[PDB]
Symmetry: C3
Subunit: 449 residues, 3 copies
């Protein structure tokens, strides 16, 4: 069935004390509004109308969904007024689902439920019963049938007794939406245009309004300040962790795990406490991740073991690799089968071959290292002359002495050996020994200052 | 109005199993007793009388508040006995507020509330209703008026039914305090001098006692063991995090944030999980702090970005600086505008100029580095001859090759260049190339052991 | 009294989605089944019969308890059927305690309680009252006496009202167990052999069954998926932390502490957030551990201070040592009194003498360093020629310049000095200066690319 979504976000987020539009504040790696848009498309929305008031520049820059139709609302004269701005773009024969830009946890399952309950020619309303319904629109019923909504400011004490409140989410036919929206007046407490008035307008037109409730309260919770955002952050993370656990992923402590993106995985993956996954991460079978690790946009093959406190970004590790602790892999880092990177080791645009080892205090940038190569501690690749960056190539079976510096561009033949403390400025022949050492001398009875 | 405070802390903290006085155990960066003293001064206390029994040496060494009058209590013959020791120092025309040295969360707001309720010539008592009032003094009332307090050991079963218990906090006039304190006898269960007896003494003298309740239970919670201390630690941290969130500071996870000191901040500051702030920290606008960072007594300018797992102490970062991950800044570290420090890099008493970069495996100590300077990986400043430490100076536009060691004292002119693997023992001219390299040689068909 | 235990674990752990037997999944550092076995032996079990179905190869490899008698159960025809397999190995005059391999938190105290309640010739049954007893065996009583157990599938609606359910744990006499087990039929809902039928069989034989309840629900909780495992992980950790706090160990945040092994300690030990202890760890008096530290199978002497993010394994630190932050100690690391290891420093099979300092960017492997020695930053020990590893020896009062590489095997006499950037390939005399430096030269007006 034809369906379109409208997201209102033209309200001012004052209690955020931010120079960034409220709906742009991230939650689990993405803008709150982006969460709403995803649910919209995920539900099958044809067009997603976004109503904004200011910061539209940062908005258009942060959001780039193909089916995103921008609707301006200069003045915030009420949710009804806002809906009237987008009304013109409602297809007569399509359904219109209204959503809030600051309610990120709304689920597709519940939205799909609201769609089904929506009577033909009627309205699908999402409501919830709170212990304290203070400050929210009150749902009124006649013989069990929803006949309208009364705002807190307009409701009488007796009416404020009603605990079934309006979440704001509702769905109706485009043509119907337009007919009602046109009849909205601002003769009420707030003195604004209530989108909630359409509920009565539909009831008196003989249309019926059905109410549906969400799975969890957190689903329809709105964010006005940072403390509320942090709260929903925990809910999201807890649900994610929980899904991963039930999905076969072992988390040492779910309360101490954060997923800010997407995580593909194999069987028996084990993740210790305080680990953060960002962007798209792929984990093979039996992957072990120590505590405090940070993995972003990376691929990790089977049986890999990531030791504690290792930062990885845009890297690709083949099977059976072991890196860390205290390893830092930067964009372009590649490790072939059984490769090993020790502590205090950094890799940027570098490839370590099969079984190759970069054990300690080393920096590999812009280099291609063959298989069975051994990089001693202190080895560094000089890939920057202050203006340009150069490549370092090391063939197979190479042994690089510690504290060796390779000045790029340079190539070290296969089976070659580089003495410790060597400065390589020229290519090294295969099966040859490169060296640049001053014979050790000594001075008897040398007293220090 | 004239007011003085008395803090009792002469009791033995046996269940702490510590060689340090109980009240000296830290909470959020400071001694529990120090928390009490702060609330005292913060309330406007003229004099703060501290009653101690032992460990007075460590106490006087840990506490150094100008208005701290030390009152000894050799024997712990009861809270009343303790108060009698300080009684002599009570000004007749001043008010006296009594507090416990092991109840760190008492708030000024509640103490200020207790002050106002205190009737002229009467007493201001702080009380709370517990689900289980077992083990605490029971508040007795006649026609709604507090007429006294009955200790648990002295109370009858029927009286132990009363749930309104004494927290210990009370305020009265100095002169009044002395008159009552003088009449204290130890004819009771414990066989000690109950400070709580003054409540009845005031009632029978025609004085009236008013009761005031605290905002939260945690406010008047006492610490006898380490488990209770940890509990209050969480309360304190949770309240702090919560204030920061509502104040505009974004915390990825409030449950995973610790503030042990003071934190000044700008707008849109973002802090990831497991971050610890110690001492006085100043954060400019839009400052980003990655997970697991530790910042102590430091200043961080606008738009700075602190990558994961970076330790900073007594450092000063100008605007737009980027340090970490895995960076360690020690006392005296200064970074000018746009400075960058990579992973596995340490700075002690060193200044990195504008736009200067210390990317990897580097140690900078006792040095002054100009602007637009580039420090290659492995570079080290030798600032210690085994007895003295020497300074290293590097002018602007300098390029330092990797694995370069500068033996201080040494100066590198502006625009100068130092070849990789160089040992600088002498000054380098401006726009000159410093070098100490052995030409690379080679030996064909070299077989390794 | 004679007692033996039987652990059933032949059930399939499907919802674990693992290639490892469910009972083998670790909890607090050890396999879930291992937890059960420990409680068995800890209670004084003579023989521990383990009933398994598959993965027996990984089981026998993971478990190696002397008194472990393996009992196979090819088909899982019910708990009763399983017990019949081990029945043959029950001593007529000994007691038999039955336990589940997936209920790791069962405590010895509660098991010892169940033993005492067990009537002579009767049965000791452990039961619990749940809010929702759905899916568990229902305990039936006649005049307050347990007369049997009815499984959920067999129980009627009315009977499912009973909230006292069977935990599975029970104890009876071997001879009695055999007599009843022989009479088990599978004429019930599940169509299996219920071990629970012995309860009725005993009742009708005139024997009496007594019921005992556990201290906590978590005690008898079973694990079928990873989410439930994580939950019990938190319970275990919380209880452990709590014991340590009450035992005098200060934990900055108990929720952020993990103990996976055994921890011996002294007085006033202080542990910051996110610290992990693995294997057997010994902590002396006044030991301080910063946040994010990982300590495994190590010994730490009095007054040691472990800075943030330091990984230690099979190391031994004498008194008053200070290591970190960002230090990595590998097997064989030893530090003598007052030794210091800075940031980005790694030690493997190395000994640092008294007062010796390895401050930065250093790697010490296979070395013996005397007292009062100073290792400058960048120093590295070359202990691997690509096939063999060699030892490095440095006598007392030695000063090693920065970025020095010692090629093993090599020995540096006492009081000797090594110039910065030196490559030591030969032994150095005592009180002598070792060097291999190229005089610094310069080239005027050198322009970079
Ligand atoms: C764990 C990390 N370890 C490392 O990084 C250490 C790497 N190893 C080295 O740097 C070693 O000193 C080397 C591989 C260069 C030598 O191996 P080793 O110490 O077992 O053998 P030697 O000391 O007897 O090697 C001497 C050879 O190297 C050459 N050599 C040694 N010092 C110098 C020098 N200053 N200039 C030119 N060649 C030299 C000689 O030509 C000689 O060749 P030959 O065998 O035909 O006489
Ligand atoms: C990413 C981090 N990278 C680094 O740290 C690498 C820093 N770069 C270096 O150390 C480079 O080897 C240098 C800057 C010294 C040379 O630049 P580059 O390799 O592009 O040029 P060249 O190899 O042709 O430089 C040769 C010059 O340096 C000098 N040079 C090279 N090796 C030696 C030596 N052993 N002794 C004395 N001078 C030497 C020569 O006097 C010569 O001068 P000229 O241009 O008048 O003939
Ligand atoms: C904080 C970490 N710091 C470090 O690692 C720095 C360690 N210090 C060094 O490497 C120093 O350069 C040294 C210990 C070698 C020299 O000490 P300092 O700079 O105060 O004294 P000098 O520069 O005047 O030392 C010169 C002596 O060393 C020797 N020396 C200096 N350069 C060389 C060289 N290229 N070849 C041989 N010997 C040399 C000379 O034989 C001379 O001996 P003398 O005193 O009888 O004339
Ligand atoms: C009049 C109305 O609809 N009342 C409902 C609305 O309250 P109420 O209107 O008071 O709520 P808000 O003002 O927060 O508006 C909700 C959303 O609409 C946006 N917005 C608001 C005004 C405007 O002119 N433009 C605009 O885009 C806000 O940015 C926010 O995303 O939500 C409550 C639940 O949260 C319901 O219980 C109320 O019955
Ligand atoms: C007699 C008395 O006052 N009773 C009150 C006291 O109990 P109670 O007297 O039993 O409590 P404590 O012994 O812990 O004393 C409270 C505080 O007084 C200090 N101290 C105690 C005795 C002494 O001789 N010197 C001294 O300095 C302790 O170190 C502690 O800081 O506090 C309870 C709340 O916590 C109240 O409900 C009780 O009504
Ligand atoms: C028939 C029976 O005993 N019923 C009890 C059993 O339920 P129930 O039999 O349904 O429970 P499970 O199937 O999980 O069996 C419990 C334990 O026995 C093992 N196992 C099971 C069958 C088998 O043939 N071999 C085997 O070794 C499982 O691996 C598990 O460790 O435990 C519940 C509590 O958890 C009790 O409330 C039930 O009254
Ligand atoms: C400074 C150095 O070269 N250390 C070597 C050396 O370190 P160990 O920590 O001892 O394993 O042996 C490794 C192979 O076992 C090699 O990969 C590494 O580079
Ligand atoms: C070993 C080395 O000198 N690396 C250089 C080099 O590292 P990259 O990680 O490739 O960016 O370029 C940097 C400037 O882009 C410079 O600051 C740094 O010192
Ligand atoms: C590169 C270097 O050698 N730094 C020295 C030097 O570091 P500082 O951080 O300045 O303390 O003095 C230390 C003794 O105070 C010595 O142990 C260390 O090795
Ligand atoms: Co070097």
């Amino acid at each position: 069935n034809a369906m379109s979504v409208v997201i209102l976000a033209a309200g001012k987020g004052t209690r955020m004390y931010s120079d960034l539009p409220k709906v742009l504040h991230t939650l689990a790696g993405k803008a709150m509004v982006q969460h709403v848009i995803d649910a919209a498309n995920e539900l099958g929305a044809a067009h997603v109308h976004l109503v904004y008031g200011h910061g539209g520049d940062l908005l258009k820059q942060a959001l780039k969904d193909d089916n995103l139709n921008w609707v301006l609302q200069a003045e915030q004269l009420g949710t009804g007024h806002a809906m009237q701005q987008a009304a013109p773009f409602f297809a007569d024969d399509e359904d219109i689902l209204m959503l809030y830009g600051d309610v990120p946890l709304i689920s597709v399952e519940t939205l799909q439920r609201l769609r089904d309950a929506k009577p033909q020619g009627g309205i699908g309303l999402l409501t919830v019963k709170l212990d304290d319904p203070t400050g929210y629109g009150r749902i009124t019923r006649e013989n069990g049938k929803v006949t309208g909504i009364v705002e807190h400011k307009d409701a009488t004490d007796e009416q404020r007794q009603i605990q079934e409140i309006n979440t704001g989410i509702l769905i109706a036919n485009g043509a119907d939406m337009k007919r009602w929206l046109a009849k909205l007046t601002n003769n009420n407490a707030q003195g604004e245009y209530y989108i909630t008035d359409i509920i009565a307008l539909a009831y008196q037109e003989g249309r019926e309004i059905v109410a549906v409730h969400p799975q969890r309260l957190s689903e329809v919770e709105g964010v006005n300040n940072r403390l509320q955002l942090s709260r929903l952050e925990r809910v999201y993370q807890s649900e994610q962790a929980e899904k991963l656990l039930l999905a076969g992923v072992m988390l040492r402590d779910p309360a101490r795990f954060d997923l800010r993106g997407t995580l593909t995985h194999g069987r028996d993956v084990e993740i210790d406490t305080n680990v953060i996954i960002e962007g798209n991460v792929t984990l093979g079978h039996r992957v072990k991740i120590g505590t405090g690790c940070v993995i972003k946009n990376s691929v990790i093959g089977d049986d890999c073991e990531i030791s504690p406190y290792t930062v990885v970004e845009d890297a690709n590790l083949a099977a059976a690799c072991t890196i860390g602790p205290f390893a830092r892999l930067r964009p372009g880092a590649e490790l072939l089968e059984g490769a090993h990177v020790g502590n205090f080791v950094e890799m940027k645009k570098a490839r370590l071959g099969k079984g190759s080892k970069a054990g300690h205090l080393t920096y590999l940038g812009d280099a291609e290292i063959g298989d069975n190569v051994n990089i001693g501690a202190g080895t560094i690749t000089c890939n920057y002359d202050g203006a340009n960056k150069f490549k370092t190539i090391i063939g197979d079976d190479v042994f690089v002495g510690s504290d060796t510096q390779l000045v790029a561009p340079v190539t070290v033949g296969k089976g070659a050996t580089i003495a410790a403390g060597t400065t390589v400025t020229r290519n090294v022949g295969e099966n040859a020994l490169a060296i640049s050492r001053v014979p050790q001398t000594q001075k008897e009875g040398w007293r220090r200052p």
